[PDB]
């Protein structure tokens, strides 16, 4: 937990920057920053007004952007910051008071009805979401899915995962259930398309395994975990990160997505030698919860993707791997492969952890490291 003030009141870390003032002094809602929408609009939360507001480009610079990136958990990564036309819809903005000096951003920002530079801050903390431009799919080219990794125990591919920083991989919590919760069991293989080239010495050691604290193995609710590598990955054409999704992606009800992995290419089949990938459509949770599909097993922390006719789907071997979508010319991580009855059967689409609802936890973990 986290301490509010000197009086000793503790709150759950999930109650930190969640819109509700759980501290009498509002500390838990007084230092809240996020990136909004597919153009990464930097926004700061106002506990008084109970609302999020973009930052004016006025007097902003790279040092403020790096500070903000650190506060979000990205450590020393910084990609870019520029002023843009606000596409977030907002109607009041945060402006830097230059006359006040050396205070942190939150003490220096104030509410303003207009920005003098007529632009708001767009901030990217890491270069991500760029690539080279499973049942029912086809073999992937080098660099097509450069965030894709293969996770091994005992010289066997067990799960997939997605690179989000040089050190951090998103995967599924059920991959790392005991007795596989020990990081020393795991090796991560990046940039390699063939399982036969994933041998001792070719991969990366894992330092930490963190499962979602509300993971329920009985229902597979909150099926997400983080792996931290012992060394930073070197990025290149073949190994690069996928972007984490921002509030306000505004995805379509049946948004077009891609899944990739070494999962069996047929139910009860063996791990594919080569990386494959396929297109799937999102399926609305209300339709996924039909008595003819998963009959109320789909929780708000899950999303469905595939085709209710079947034919194309993830399978055994794909757990933890990416479900991604392209928007604003950026690839975003929308889900992690979690569960699904059979493989590619009609009325049994794939179920994925809903990464949007986990992003705040992910940031907290990266920041706490």
């Amino acid at each position, epitope marked *: 937990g986290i301490e509010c003030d000197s009086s000793g009141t503790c709150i759950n870390p999930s109650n930190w920057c969640d819109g509700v003032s759980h501290c009498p002094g509002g500390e838990d809602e007084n230092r809240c920053v996020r990136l909004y929408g597919p153009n990464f609009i930097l926004q700061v939360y106002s506990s008084q007004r109970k609302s999020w507001h973009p930052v004016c480009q006025d007097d902003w610079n790279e040092n403020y952007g790096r500070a903000a990136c650190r506060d979000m958990g990205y450590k020393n990564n910084f990609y870019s910051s520029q002023g843009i036309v606000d596409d977030s819809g907002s109607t009041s903005f945060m402006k830097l008071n230059t006359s006040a000096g050396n205070v942190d951003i939150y003490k220096k920002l104030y509410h303003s009805d207009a920005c003098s530079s007529k632009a708001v801050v767009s901030l990217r903390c890491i270069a991500c979401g760029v690539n080279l431009n499973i049942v029912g799919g086809e073999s992937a080219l080098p660099g097509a899915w450069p965030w894709q990794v293969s996770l091994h125990v005992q010289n066997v591919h067990v799960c997939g995962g997605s690179i989000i920083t040089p050190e951090w991989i998103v995967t599924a919590a*059920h991959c790392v*259930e005991k007795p596989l919760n020990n990081p020393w069991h795991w090796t991560a293989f990046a940039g390699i398309l063939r399982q036969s080239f994933m041998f001792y010495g070719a991969g990366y050691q894992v330092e930490k395994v963190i499962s979602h604290p509300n993971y329920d193995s*009985k229902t597979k609710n909150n099926d997400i975990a983080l792996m931290k590598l012992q060394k930073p990955l070197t990025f290149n054409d073949l190994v690069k990160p996928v972007c984490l999704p921002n509030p306000g992606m505004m995805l379509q009800p049946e948004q077009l997505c891609w899944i990739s992995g070494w*999962g069996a290419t047929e*139910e*009860k089949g063996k791990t594919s030698e080569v990386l494959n990938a396929a297109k799937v459509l999102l399926i609305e949770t209300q339709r996924c919860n039909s008595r003819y599909v998963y009959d109320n*097993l789909i929780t708000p922390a899950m999303i469905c993707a595939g085709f209710l006719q079947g034919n194309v789907d993830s399978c055994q071997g794909d*757990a933890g791997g990416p479900l991604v979508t392209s928007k604003n010319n950026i690839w975003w991580l929308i889900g992690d492969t979690s569960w699904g009855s*059979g493989c590619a059967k009609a009325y049994r689409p794939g179920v994925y952890g809903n990464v949007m609802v986990f992003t705040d936890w992910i940031y907290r973990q990266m920041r706490a490291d």
Partner: nanobody
Amino acid sequence: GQVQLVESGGGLVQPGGSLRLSCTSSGSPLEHYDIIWFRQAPGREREGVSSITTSGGHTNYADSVKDRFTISRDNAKNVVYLQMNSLKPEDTAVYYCAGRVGGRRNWIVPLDGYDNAYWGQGTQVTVSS
């Protein structure tokens, strides 16, 4: 709906005999669930004896029952089976099925997974002369 597991096939047999346990479900089809058979005899600790994934592609056995027991499933018939051959007095126990929503990882279902699972009512197995 929440899955409701129901085991059957237990009963009294002599040493050396066989039984076929089976488990079906109401509320939610068994096809969605990884299944662990565990057993408990009065006075002793619970013991996971066999497990199987939703697809049937990974099975798992306690050393004490390997070669004698065989787990399998039929999703179209909504049933999971435990064939138990060459039974011994030490196999006497109530046998339970435990289910979890099954994941897509490429690994066995651990035998101690009944500790967080849906459970059936159990079926008594007695092996004696």
